[PDB]
Structure 1
Amino acid sequence: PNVVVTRLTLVCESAPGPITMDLTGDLEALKKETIVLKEGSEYRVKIHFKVNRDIVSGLKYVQHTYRTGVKVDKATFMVGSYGPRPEEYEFLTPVEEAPKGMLARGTYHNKSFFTDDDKQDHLSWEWNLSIKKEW
C-alpha cells in the first residue's frame, strides 16, 4: 500500500528504556504487550509511517482510550501531507502528562486509527497502557 504504518513509540526522556511496538507484526499479539509509564510522566505518542509512491494529504491519527468507570476519551490529531520517500516519517502528538494517584494506576485500553480525510483504514490497532508508581 502507499501508506504503511510501521511503529508506535512513547517518547519519554525519563523512561529507563525504549517504549515501542512494531506495527508491522501480529496485531493480535500487541494487546498482550506490556507498555508501562511511571505515573505523572510527560510523554508524547509517536507514530512512524511510510509513504511509498504518491503524495498524500489529510492524514489523521485518532486514539480512543478506555478506562473503567470513565467515558471513552476520543482524541484526533491532524497529521497532514507527506510525499513518498524510502525513510519512515514520524508524527508526534503534543506532550501530555500520564495519570497519577492510587486510583489512576493500572490499565488504559487504547484503540488507535491512522486514517485520512478520505476515511481510509491505513491501520487500526489495539494496545494497553499500564500506569505504575515506578518504572
Structure 2
Amino acid sequence: APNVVVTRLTLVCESAPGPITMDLTGDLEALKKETIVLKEGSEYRVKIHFKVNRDIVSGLKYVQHTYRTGVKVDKATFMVGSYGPRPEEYEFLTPVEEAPKGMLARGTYHNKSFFTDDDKQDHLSWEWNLSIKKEWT
C-alpha cells in the first residue's frame, strides 16, 4: 500500500437529512454517476479522510476545482500539513461555506479534487458531482 491513502470525502452539513459521503477507495469511474444533493444556501464543510501508513509526511494539500456552466472554474487550495503514521484515519475539514442559492444557482456543479503535497505527489485525484436544489428532495 502507498504511504498516503485517501479513503473518503464527506460533506459536513448540519441541516442535511442524512449522511453525504463517498468511499474513495472504491470505483472512481462509478462515482461520477452519483449526484450529491445540497439544499441551496446550506452551510457545509468538505471533510477529507485519509491514512498515513508508514512514514511521517509533510506539506499535504487539498485542491478542489469546481466547474459551473457560464462561470470561470472556482479553484481552492487548502494547506493540510504534516501527519505521522497510525492505524486510524485522519480527517481534514475546509472552512465553512454557504452553498449557492437562488434559482439561477441551482443544478449541476462538477468538482475535480486533488489530494497532493509540496512534492506534487498524486495521492488521489477524483471527480464528483453536486446538484444544488430548492429543497433537499
- TM-score (norm. length: structure 1): 0.99
Distance apart, 1:120 and its partner CA: 0.1
Corresponding residue of 2:56: 55
Cα distance in 1 for partners of 2:54, 2:9 equals 22
Q: Percent identity?
A: 100
Corresponding residue of 2:73: 72
Gaps of 5+ in 2: none
Deviation digits for residues 37-88 of structure 1, max 9, x if unmatched?
0000000000000000000000000000000000001000000000000000
Distance apart, 1:34 and its partner CA: 1.8
Corresponding residue of 2:132: 131
SS at match of 1:32: coil
Corresponding residue of 2:17: 16
SS at match of 1:103: helix
Deviation digits for residues 80-130 of structure 1, max 9, x if unmatched?
000000000000000000000000000000000000000000000000011
Cα distance in 2 for partners of 1:54, 1:36 equals 37
Cα distance in 2 for partners of 1:34, 1:76 equals 23
Q: CA RMSD in A?
A: 0.3
Matches within 5 A, 1:109-120: 109-120=110-121
Gaps of 5+ in 1: none
Cα distance in 2 for partners of 1:13, 1:79 equals 23
**Runs of 4+ more than 6 Å apart:** none
SS at match of 1:94: coil
- TM-score (norm. length: structure 2): 0.98
Cα distance in 1 for partners of 2:46, 2:9 equals 7
SS at match of 2:122: coil
Q: Number of paired residues? A: 135
